[PDB]
Write an enzyme that holds these catalytic residues in place. Structure first.
Site, mmCIF file in Angstrom:
data_model
loop_
_atom_site.group_PDB
_atom_site.id
_atom_site.type_symbol
_atom_site.label_atom_id
_atom_site.label_comp_id
_atom_site.label_asym_id
_atom_site.label_seq_id
_atom_site.Cartn_x
_atom_site.Cartn_y
_atom_site.Cartn_z
ATOM 1 N N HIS A 68 10.075 35.150 46.802
ATOM 2 C CA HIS A 68 10.774 36.193 47.610
ATOM 3 C C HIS A 68 9.785 37.277 48.048
ATOM 4 C CE1 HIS A 68 14.586 34.322 46.211
ATOM 5 N NE2 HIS A 68 14.874 34.584 47.488
ATOM 6 N N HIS A 72 7.529 34.665 52.693
ATOM 7 C CA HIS A 72 8.933 34.227 52.898
ATOM 8 C C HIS A 72 9.526 34.960 54.106
ATOM 9 C CE1 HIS A 72 12.969 32.914 52.340
ATOM 10 N NE2 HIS A 72 13.372 34.173 52.184
ATOM 11 N N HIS A 106 15.050 40.821 55.552
ATOM 12 C CA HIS A 106 16.288 40.320 54.897
ATOM 13 C C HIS A 106 16.131 40.223 53.376
ATOM 14 C CE1 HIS A 106 14.327 36.477 54.484
ATOM 15 N NE2 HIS A 106 15.339 36.056 53.718
ATOM 16 N N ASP A 107 14.916 40.258 52.815
ATOM 17 C CA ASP A 107 14.698 40.184 51.339
ATOM 18 C C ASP A 107 13.849 41.374 50.848
ATOM 19 O OD1 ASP A 107 16.203 37.976 50.167
ATOM 20 O OD2 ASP A 107 14.686 36.558 50.830
ATOM 21 N N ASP A 217 16.739 31.179 56.461
ATOM 22 C CA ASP A 217 16.502 31.466 55.030
ATOM 23 C C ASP A 217 16.177 30.189 54.261
ATOM 24 O OD1 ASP A 217 16.155 33.348 53.052
ATOM 25 O OD2 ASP A 217 18.301 33.567 52.660
#
Ligand SMILES: CS(=O)(=O)c1cccc(-n2ccc(=O)c(-c3ccnn3-c3cc(F)ccc3F)n2)c1
Ligand SMILES: [Cl-]
Ligand SMILES: [Mg+2]
Ligand SMILES: [Zn+2]
Length: 313
Positions: A68, A72, A106-107, A217
């Site tokens: 993560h 990524h 998004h992470d 994702d």
């Protein structure tokens, strides 16, 4: 304005393909992302000074975790780029802007642990955000970075264009909560099969953008087998660390997270392909036919895992 980002020939060609791997050179990832914004969106849609400062603050707020991480983020952004580029006419100016940034962010500040572990640990974030815990944090982190001086890449949008793009980004990042994916895909499956799917219905777009985010994702399962197989090590490094932490809380973890049950990974991957990834790319291909290469690469990797189980590798 006449400053283009240019990639070496091999990257220039392969970046257009769904199965592109962004490579092991960290310091080229920012350029690769700006390159994708310039071609997807235009050279004018962001002030380079503000974009560059936004990209490097986002990089800084990703952690040194096995999966993560910053790699990524850029990988997920690239999959979204491939989808927008193969579906030129179906998305608004604002959707192209919002979604590449949504994917990059998004992470944000992921610690390598599932919403489940936060809840059982009783982490403050689990008190602040009772559902989609990490994904609400991710959006929160996105908003905080946009508000640093000189980091507001949306400055030259109107008040209503601005409210729209932050709303696109919020739903996009929330949809990356895989617990929400199952219901989202079921509904899109129903709507496609009754002929009720309407891309002018904003709440239909929302669901389609949701499924694109799950697709981007999960996109490590859509790469050449050697990429997919080696990403799996990184994915499982995080899973087994969370299993270790579960056992420390006195909880037996699910077998996926138990490093004792390392033998069960190949069957666990089949379940995930059959239960999650194949349905995801199938429904995406029904709604957006030019994303078929993602379904095809995913099927090839399912076959590769079937060969692992059958002792052929
Ligand atoms: C038990 S379940 O609800 O089916 C469930 C919940 C969480 C993770 C998985 N899971 C299992 C095996 C995998 O290979 C992946 C996978 C592949 C590519 N990305 N991810 C991924 C996806 C995430 F969301 C998080 C972390 C990830 F590595 N995910 C399944
Ligand atoms: Cl183009
Ligand atoms: Mg996430
Ligand atoms: Zn992610």
């Amino acid at each position: 304005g006449l400053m283009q980002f240019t990639l070496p020939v091999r990257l220039c060609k392969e970046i257009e393909l769904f199965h592109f791997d962004i490579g092991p050179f960290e310091n080229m990832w920012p350029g690769i992302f700006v390159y994708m914004v310039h071609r997807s969106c235009g050279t004018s849609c962001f002030e380079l000074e503000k974009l560059c400062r936004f990209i490097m603050s986002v990089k800084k707020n990703y952690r040194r975790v096995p999966y993560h991480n910053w790699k990524h983020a850029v990988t997920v952004a690239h999959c979204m780029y491939a989808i927008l580029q193969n579906n030129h006419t179906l998305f608004t100016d604002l959707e192209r802007k919002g979604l590449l940034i949504a994917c990059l962010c998004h992470d944000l500040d992921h610690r390598g642990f599932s919403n489940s572990y936060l809840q059982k640990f009783d982490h403050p974030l689990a008190a602040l955000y009772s559902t989609s815990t990490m994904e609400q944090h991710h959006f929160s982190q996105t908003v905080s970075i946009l508000q640093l001086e000189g980091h507001n890449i949306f400055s030259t949008l109107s008040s209503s264009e601005y409210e729209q793009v932050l709303e696109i980004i919020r739903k996009a990042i929330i949809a990356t909560d895989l617990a929400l994916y199952f219901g989202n895909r079921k509904q899109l499956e129903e709507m496609y099969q009754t002929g009720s799917l309407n891309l002018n219905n904003q709440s239909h777009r929302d669901r389609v953008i949701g499924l694109m985010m799950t697709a981007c994702d999960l996109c490590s399962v859509t790469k050449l087998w050697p990429v997919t197989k080696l990403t799996a090590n990184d994915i499982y490094a995080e899973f087994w660390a969370e299993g270790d932490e579960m056992k420390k809380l006195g909880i037996q973890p699910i077998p996926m997270m138990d490093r004792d049950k390392k033998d069960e990974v190949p069957q666990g991957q089949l379940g995930f392909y059959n239960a999650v990834a194949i349905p995801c790319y199938t429904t995406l291909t029904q709604i957006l036919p030019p994303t078929e290469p993602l379904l095809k690469a995913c099927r090839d990797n399912l076959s590769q895992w079937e060969k692992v189980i059958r002792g052929e590798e």
